[PDB]
Design a protein around this nucleic acid. Structure first.
Ligand SMILES: Nc1ncnc2c1ncn2[C@@H]1O[C@H](COP(=O)(O)OP(=O)(O)O)[C@@H](O)[C@H]1O
Lengths: 1238, 529
DNA sequence: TTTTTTT
């Protein structure tokens, strides 16, 4: 029991809550140890705080003490009522134990068991960082620590200089006004201890090896004269250590460049070589004591090289308030900033750097935000349910509030150009104009909603559908996890309100979709393609799903305009690049589809026939390895199940389980059939159950999975992969999805040439006869959405862009002589050189939402919070030249796993987020190489961590058993359960006999996971709240992937990211030398991308495929397999139209006629090669070898394979992949006739 | 008899893995067999006669064709190596062919295949008899002349020839921080020894002689005179290839006709895989650069001819691919695109006469003479010159800048340097092209950077960064004459790249020949950049 | 017998 006096020597408020700081060396405070109660008084003798000690840190003049339990005395209590004395000379003092025990309930009314425990997690995230930092860097014990029974070289991993890398340095720029500076250097040194002074033994009685640490350091003063730096030794006791460098001449601005180095020059002895090494170095540069102004450090030179870019200048404009002051040579740097943000006072080096990132939110919840947003949140004007019941005038009154405050904000931002944007006035005006443009478009959207009535009906329908889906998804999720709840709980205002940028985007997108005669969609120049960008975690997906719902609702009310049908057909096409991503997007879209279907069914019963009779449906268009391509396979899978057509695991509407062998029905197929999926509700109350939906035109869950069923009855929404779009040149029945139909069968559906049915049937099995009927065509779809647009670049983006010629053409239709084109919406996390990219792939004018403003921190919709009010995500860097990667990885993994257990044993269940650890890896080979090390060596080093004589202060003992590897080798059935495997927490109960928390597991319970590993993408299925710790192996190949991957942890709890960087690789070292600046200005460093179609190497691969894709689907004579050989003079006039549209797009995209001439020549070459083969007689010319006539049929095109690439080779995928070669093992026993010899 | 194990991409078979290498599969390790046991008639031939005329010149006139790697029992034959393994649970150490280890496999899902220790009962024999997973040994013995063998545990644990036949154990030496200390314990004689005694100069007293084993050919040599070495499993210095390549040009050294064709005033355009453009020259580099040529259609072939074990090739150290003189050799071809840069003649001739250039040339020649005499070779031959070193340094800096700026992958781009000056037709130029047919920028992404508005940016940003290295004081002070090094002022941290890209193998490099460093100033070629 | 990840 010790006494103390409070003085508040520290600034960091979170740390001043839980710590106590005392001046002087720990040698004056040696009697204070662990688990000792202390009592704190102020300078006037009033009792303040009581705590229990967890850990002690020390330095050369200060000591830091941490707690785990603390109580605060609120009353003003005089010390004079206690028999204890005042602390003399502000030092420690022993307290009487029995008097303390008697005094605790007598005056403070507390006992030992009544003391609470610390619950904050920002304290735990600091303790973990200190515990790892002590082990990896040192010194572990203190300034005068002792190292027993091991060499001092291998005890520590980073921060050591070898005798004759051996040197470190940094570069900085200084002001020309001053002429002398001050340099400080410090390091550490170890010395062998003789035997007769220490009494440390082995188990058998032999003496051990003991080293002792002694500090060093000294200060110098340096005048600045041009030339090299004179050699100097800070410490007299070690005259072979140097600080050196050079000083350069003046620049045009009037500043000087100074380069420094710290070099170890000691010699190597024959014995005890560890005494020649230098440990824990650092450098500090400061202005002189008698100088007039402290701030003398300025910005590093720009080094322009004659290049201009409006985007680059805008990026330099927004990030003007965060300045880079120095660079490092082998060590990271850190700089202190004065009251002027352009001036710095001190620069220093740091061996392992740390930095924390501010978080972004949507405003409206805090007291300091704008009054209009708080008024909108408090008055319920964002409610989806309320907006569908109001009259038109209260609706426009509620919608005008979003625009009036935006106009006020734009007017306010205009005044600050002259004051707060000096040197950037032109970019300020250019950024000012686009906010006025956006406000103009918002008022235009409100005007469009005022005059039209079909738009108002569609708006109300979309609002109701979104609200219903939003409410019911949470109930389904809660019901699937065994919770006993009702539907009454989830109907609150909190779970059914908008967020402002989603509603703003909805109001932006209204005028282009309500009237096809809008100038956006009827002319080829100045057509806008809306790019949406935001930090990950904001509701972008819910933002464009509402646009999709509005687009679906308005199309059925417009009528049959221009001789096209609008009561049915495909409307929205959604595409992705990752197959797994489509699988999680489908489960999201099905709930919205179900909600629209339930609304439509209730509307028809009342007598309102506005929505039509055809139901809403949704389909999947992905590769045949996932989905069945023909109904026979759909029958075969179900037949093999009872002794894949089921992509759903649970019912989206009620959460009931689905049995594959009972809840799937396949109708008999003489020529075609239909597959249905029913809900598993046995008691029969769900609307999609077998007892209810049997009367509907499309019974059960409205989903289509089979390719032929999609081709015969097209859905309303389609979710597909980009690589499936390359199959147009192979199969001609895809033309139904674009609306090129003429005939229809009553028994089966829409027809194409070469189909099985012809529409004529006799009576069979009691069914009536039918005959073929003719029908007008169907309108092509209206809206195309492309997600993850930053991944559309390079060799993949080239072929996405080249194949987009036909897709943009085949959705065109004519209305009153004009040509109508589809609206394009894209979404991405980043933006860099977006204009050239969008013009290359899409051939549109780009428009980015929301605009920048005059600051990074603040625009109207995004607010960046401060560290005081909300926590952020802390990064930390580790790097060691010359060390092997497994030696780093084993030490890092062992340190984290062992420190997490020590935080567990004293605190309990709040240590859960750091308990399981996630690892990211760049390659599969390195993941497999690390997998064997994780099972064997990591477990062994974790089990032996506190049974040697070497002292490791903060690590603890843990057992590692469960390792999972989340990669491409897991079947999809257990993947939802693997995601539900990670949900279980480390159960712990308090053991009062030992005084610590211990994980006891019952009979047959589910154990948790210790280590989980990940490939290039994480699981990314749900936002599981548990994960809060992550380590990255190396720097990834792109910046956007780096921002994406490390943003998946720490969403509900404080996070921690640690990056292990190699020394040999250029990017890793380069990012290490600028760690602090790179992680403060993220968007400045996004790497360049390019999309270059019509280059020759893309033209040898994609040209014939695009030409055939355009030629097949647009005509009837060339549609089927026998369409080849029909090319003759009467039909040759329709190929020039396709050649001309290809050449027109090539000339417009390249904006250079030298490309257009080459494209025209290459198209003419292919046309004249086609004309030669079709005129050959005596044979049937076909596209492929198929049908009973294959004994005489010759194919025209080839598939990629062993043969050399030629003009007629057509790919089957967007991306080229080279096929691998397998290995054959020859297992046999070998005898030996040869022997070893010396 | 046979069973599948795994699969790899066929571009690696000439650069990493291949005949005689150790493939680190996730469960075990194998060694590829020689090409005389490969399926001859399932390898598709590749037509390039100009490369054949050099392959025949090196390996004799009996070679016939260049052939591609092949493509349920078809594949590449392998055999397990090393044969000594360790059980995790009980720590027992035994060879595979003693019968105590058996294999669990699936012939339809062959990625899961691994060895298990049959009937494990633990260290004390008290645990129930169950199969338990095992890990291969982590030490091997290597020889300079080409031979490889397992570690001699039996000789090492008893200090010589022995009679005992008991089991062996492995331990982690108790303490957690220590990887340097390991223990081998005999269950019968109760003796022990440490693995630290096999490294340093202590290996000469303890380790036995080399045997002469070729695991991939399955043969033993009569005698070997080289001193063996102890090497870790999966070390970087275990296998180096010998490669030869040429370019496809329209129609006796390989590099000669390429320089003749590329320097013509009108380059031909009739060949289907040769098309070139003439896009400008940056305004900052007018006096130095005379012609920039962008290539949009380019074709390259390769060959594999042999391998060495411990040291890189400079030929007595080459190891053959077959028992006899082989009839065919593997081949690979890649269709790509490239950029060619030509430099001014008079600027280079004027710069060669300065005094500091002669000083650096004398220093490098002295270092080369010191380096060749340490291996008993002729020290008066094979000096490429100082211009070669200058161009070779500029190439490495440009290739590093390509990956630093554009975000490319490191091993995507190869190099090729033309610097002969002895035959009366002087050469000055570098060539940069793509390595694989599926790398970054293969679809016109590299010719984009050939515009004058980007190449000057790349050169300026390359030259600005190279002024100060991360180990700068001792890097600039390095003298190649003292330590017989073949490089000066160019460490790992500022000059060198991955081993796939370099043509000579990180030799003849000097950054002071380009820009003023901290100790040489007057030897620079680019001034004020 | 067709669709895609990954160095
Ligand atoms: N209107 C809303 N109200 C409350 N939360 C919302 C709303 N819209 C989206 N969210 C939240 O956003 C999360 C999903 O974000 P998402 O749209 O997937 O981001 P991304 O832009 O990556 O698609 C969900 O967990 C949900 O809680």
């Amino acid at each position: 029991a010790w006494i103390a006096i409070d003085h508040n020597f520290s600034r960091a408020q979170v740390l001043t809550y839980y710590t106590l700081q005392l001046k002087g060396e720990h040698s004056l405070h040696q009697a204070i140890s662990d688990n000792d109660w202390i009592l704190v008084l102020d300078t006037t003798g009033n009792i303040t705080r009581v705590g229990r000690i967890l850990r002690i840190r020390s330095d050369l003049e200060t000591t830091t003490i941490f707690f785990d339990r603390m109580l605060q005395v609120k009353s003003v209590v005089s010390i004079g009522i206690t028999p204890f004395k005042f602390p003399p000379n502000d030092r420690a003092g022993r307290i009487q134990w029995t008097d303390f025990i008697e005094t605790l309930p007598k005056e403070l009314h507390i006992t030992i068991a009544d003391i609470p425990k610390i619950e904050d997690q920002t304290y735990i995230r600091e303790l973990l960082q200190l515990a790892v930092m002590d082990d990896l860097l040192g010194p572990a014990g203190g300034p005068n620590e002792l190292i027993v029974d091991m060499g001092v070289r291998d005890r520590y991993l980073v921060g050591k200089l070898a005798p004759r890398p051996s040197s470190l340095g940094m570069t900085f720029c200084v002001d020309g006004d001053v002429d002398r500076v001050e340099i400080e250097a410090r390091w550490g040194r170890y010395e062998r201890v003789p035997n007769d002074e220490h009494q440390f033994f082995k188990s058998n009685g032999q003496k051990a090896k003991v080293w002792k640490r002694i500090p060093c350091g000294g200060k110098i003063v340096l005048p600045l004269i041009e030339g090299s730096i004179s050699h100097n030794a800070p410490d007299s006791t070690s005259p072979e250590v140097r600080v050196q460098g050079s000083i350069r001449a003046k620049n045009d601005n009037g500043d000087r460049l100074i380069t420094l180095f710290l070099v170890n020059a000691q010699e190597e002895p024959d014995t005890n070589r560890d005494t020649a090494w230098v440990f824990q170095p650092e450098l500090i540069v400061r202005a002189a004591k008698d100088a007039a102004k402290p701030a003398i450090f300025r910005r590093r030179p720009v080094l322009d090289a004659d290049g201009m870019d409006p985007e680059r200048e805008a990026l330099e404009m927004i990030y003007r308030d965060r300045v880079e002051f120095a660079v490092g040579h082998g060590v990271a740097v850190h700089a202190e900033i004065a009251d002027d943000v352009t001036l710095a006072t001190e620069v220093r080096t740091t061996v392992m750097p740390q930095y924390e990132v501010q978080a972004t939110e949507t405003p409206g919840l805090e007291l300091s935000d704008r009054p209009a947003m708080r008024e909108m949140v408090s008055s319920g004007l964002l409610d989806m349910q309320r907006l569908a019941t109001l009259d038109i005038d209260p609706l426009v009154d509620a919608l005008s509030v979003l625009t009036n405050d935006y106009a006020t904000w734009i007017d306010e931002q205009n005044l600050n150009v002259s004051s707060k944007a000096k040197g950037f006035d032109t970019q300020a005006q250019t950024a000012i104009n686009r906010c006025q443009e956006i406000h103009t478009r918002l008022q235009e959207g409100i005007n469009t909603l005022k005059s039209n009535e079909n738009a108002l009906a569609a708006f109300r329908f979309a609002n109701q559908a979104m609200a219903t889906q939003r409410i019911r998804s949470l109930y389904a999720l809660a019901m699937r996890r065994g919770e006993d709840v009702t539907l009454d709980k989830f109907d609150v205002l909190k779970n059914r309100s908008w967020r402002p940028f989603q509603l703003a985007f909805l109001l932006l997108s209204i005028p282009s979709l309500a009237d096809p005669c809008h100038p956006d969609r009827v002319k080829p120049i100045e057509a806008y393609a809306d790019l949406l960008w935001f930090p990950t975690g904001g509701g972008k997906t819910e933002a464009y799903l509402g646009v999709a719902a509005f687009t679906m609702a308005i199309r059925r009310m417009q009528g049959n305009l221009g001789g096209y049908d609008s009561s049915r057909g495909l409307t929205v096409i959604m595409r992705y690049t990752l197959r797994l991503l489509t699988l999680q997007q489908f489960q999201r879209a099905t709930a919205l589809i179900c909600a629209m279907e339930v609304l439509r069914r209730e509307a028809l019963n009342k007598g309102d026939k506005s929505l039509g009779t055809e139901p809403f449906t949704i389909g999947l268009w992905v590769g045949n390895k996932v989905t069945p391509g023909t109904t026979e396979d759909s029958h075969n899978a179900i037949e093999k199940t009872r002794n894949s057509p089921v992509q759903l695991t649970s019912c989206p509407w009620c959460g009931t389980e689905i049995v594959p062998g009972q809840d799937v029905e396949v109708k008999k197929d003489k020529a075609g059939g239909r597959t249905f999926v029913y809900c598993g509700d046995k008691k029969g109350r769900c609307e999609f159950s077998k007892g209810k939906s049997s009367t509907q035109p499309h019974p059960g869950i409205p989903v289509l999975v089979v390719d032929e069923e999609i081709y015969h009855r097209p859905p309303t929404m389609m979710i597909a992969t980009v690589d499936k779009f390359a199959m147009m040149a192979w199969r001609g029945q895809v033309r139904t999805l674009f609306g090129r139909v003429e005939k229809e069968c009553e028994r089966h559906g829409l027809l194409w040439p070469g189909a099985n049915c012809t529409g004529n049937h006799q009576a069979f099995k009691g069914q009536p006869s039918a005959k073929v009927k003719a029908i007008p065509p169907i309108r092509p779809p209206d809206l195309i959405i492309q997600d993850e647009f930053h991944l559309i670049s390079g060799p993949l983006g080239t072929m996405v862009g080249l194949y987009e010629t036909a897709v943009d053409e085949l959705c065109s239709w004519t209305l009153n002589g004009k040509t109508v084109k589809p609206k394009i919406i894209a979404s991405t996390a980043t933006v860099r050189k977006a204009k050239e990219q969008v013009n290359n792939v899409f051939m549109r004018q780009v428009s980015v939402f929301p605009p920048h403003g005059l600051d990074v921190e603040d625009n109207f919709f995004s607010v960046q919070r401060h560290i005081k009010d909300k926590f952020g995500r802390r990064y930390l860097g580790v790097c060691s030249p010359g060390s092997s990667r497994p030696a780093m990885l084993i030490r890092v993994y062992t340190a984290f796993l062992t420190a997490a257990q020590e935080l567990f044993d004293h605190f309990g269940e709040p240590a859960d987020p750091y308990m399981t650890m996630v690892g990211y890896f760049n390659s599969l080979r390195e993941l497999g190489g690390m997998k064997r090390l994780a099972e064997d060596d990591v477990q062994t080093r974790s089990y032996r961590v506190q049974m040697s004589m070497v002292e490791r202060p903060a690590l603890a003992q843990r057992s590692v058993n469960n390792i999972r590897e989340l990669t491409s080798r897991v079947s999809s059935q257990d993947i939802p359960k693997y995601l539900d495997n990670l949900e279980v927490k480390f159960k712990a109960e308090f053991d009062s006999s030992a005084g610590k928390y211990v994980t006891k597991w019952q009979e047959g319970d589910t154990r948790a996971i210790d280590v989980v590993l990940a490939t290039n993408m994480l699981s990314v299925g749900v936002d599981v709240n548990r994960l809060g710790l992550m380590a990255v192996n190396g720097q990834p190949k792109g910046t956007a992937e780096y921002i994406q991957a490390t943003s998946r942890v720490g969403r509900s709890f404080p996070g921690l990211v640690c990056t292990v960087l190699t020394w040999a690789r250029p990017r890793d070292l380069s990012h290490y030398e600028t760690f602090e600046h790179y992680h403060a200005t993220f968007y400045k460093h996004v790497e360049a991308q390019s999309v270059t179609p019509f280059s020759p190497r893309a033209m040898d691969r994609g040209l014939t495929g695009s030409l055939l894709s355009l030629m097949r689907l647009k005509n009837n004579e060339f549609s089927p397999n026998e369409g080849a050989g029909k090319l003759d003079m009467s039909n040759q006039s329709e190929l020039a139209h396709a050649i001309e549209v290809l050449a027109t797009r090539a000339g417009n995209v390249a904006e250079d006629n030298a490309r257009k001439l080459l494209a025209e020549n290459e198209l003419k070459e292919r046309a004249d090669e086609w004309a030669k083969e079709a005129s050959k007689g005596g044979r049937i010319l076909g596209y492929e070898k198929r049908g009973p006539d294959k004994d005489k049929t010759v194919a025209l095109i080839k598939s990629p394979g062993l043969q050399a690439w030629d003009n007629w080779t057509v790919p089957m995928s967007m991306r080229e992949v080279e096929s691998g070669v397998r290995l054959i093992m020859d297992t046999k026993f070998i005898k030996d006739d040869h022997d070893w010899k010396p | 008899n046979k069973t599948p194990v795994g699969e790899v991409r066929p571009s690696q078979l000439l650069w990493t893995y291949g005949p005689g290498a150790l493939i680190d599969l996730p469960s075990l390790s194998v060694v590829t067999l020689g090409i005389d046991r490969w399926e001859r008639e399932r390898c598709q031939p590749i037509q390039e006669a100009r490369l054949l005329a050099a392959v025949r010149k090196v390996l004799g006139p009996q070679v016939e064709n260049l052939r591609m790697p092949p493509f349920a029992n078809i594949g590449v034959p392998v055999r397990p190596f090393p044969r000594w393994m360790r059980c995790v649970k009980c720590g027992l150490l035994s060879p595979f062919d003693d019968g105590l280890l058996e294999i669990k496999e699936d012939r339809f899902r062959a990625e899961r295949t691994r060895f298990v220790h049959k009937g494990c009962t633990g260290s004390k024999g008290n645990l129930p008899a169950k199969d338990a997973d095992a890990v291969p040994a982590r030490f091997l013995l290597a020889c300079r002349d080409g031979h490889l063998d397992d570690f001699p545990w039996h000789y090492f644990v008893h200090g010589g020839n022995s009679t005992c036949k008991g089991t062996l154990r492995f331990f982690e030496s108790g303490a957690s921080l220590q990887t340097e200390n390991l223990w081998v314990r005999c269950d019968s004689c109760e003796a022990s020894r440490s693995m630290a005694h096999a490294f340093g100069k202590a290996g000469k007293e303890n380790l036995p002689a080399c045997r002469g084993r070729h695991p991939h050919l399955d043969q033993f040599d009569i005698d070997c005179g080289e001193e063996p070495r102890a090497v870790l499993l999966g070390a970087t210095n275990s296998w180096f290839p010998i490669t030869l390549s040429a370019l496809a040009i329209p129609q006796a050294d390989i590099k000669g006709p390429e320089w003749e064709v590329l320097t013509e005033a009108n380059p031909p355009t009739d060949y289907p895989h040769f098309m070139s453009k003439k896009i400008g020259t940056p305004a900052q580099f007018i006096p130095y650069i005379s012609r920039v040529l962008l290539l949009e259609r380019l074709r390259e072939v390769n060959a594999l001819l042999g391998f060495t074990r411990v040291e890189a090739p400079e030929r007595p150290q080459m190891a053959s691919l077959a028992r006899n003189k082989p009839e065919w050799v593997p081949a690979n071809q890649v269709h790509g695109e490239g950029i060619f840069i030509q430099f001014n003649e008079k600027t280079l001739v004027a710069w060669e006469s300065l005094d500091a250039v002669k000083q650096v040339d004398e220093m490098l020649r002295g270092g080369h003479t010191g380096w060749r005499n340490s291996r008993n070779l002729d020290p008066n031959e094979d000096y490429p010159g100082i211009r070669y070193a200058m161009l070779h340094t500029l190439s490495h800096l440009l290739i590093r800048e390509l990956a630093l700026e554009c975000g490319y992958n490191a091993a995507s781009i190869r190099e090729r340097i033309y610097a002969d000056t002895s035959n009366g037709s002087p050469q000055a130029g570098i060539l940069i092209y793509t390595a694989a047919a599926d790398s970054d920028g293969t679809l016109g992404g590299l010719v984009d950077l050939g515009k004058p508005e980007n190449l000057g940016r790349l050169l300026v940003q390359a030259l600005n960064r190279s002024k100060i290295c991360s180990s700068d004081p001792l890097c600039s002070e390095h003298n190649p004459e003292k330590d017989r090094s073949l490089h000066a002022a160019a460490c790992h941290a500022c000059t060198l790249v991955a081993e796939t890209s370099c043509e000579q193998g990180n030799r003849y490099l000097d950054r002071s020949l380009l820009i003023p460093t901290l100790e040489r100033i007057h030897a620079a070629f680019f001034k004020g950049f």
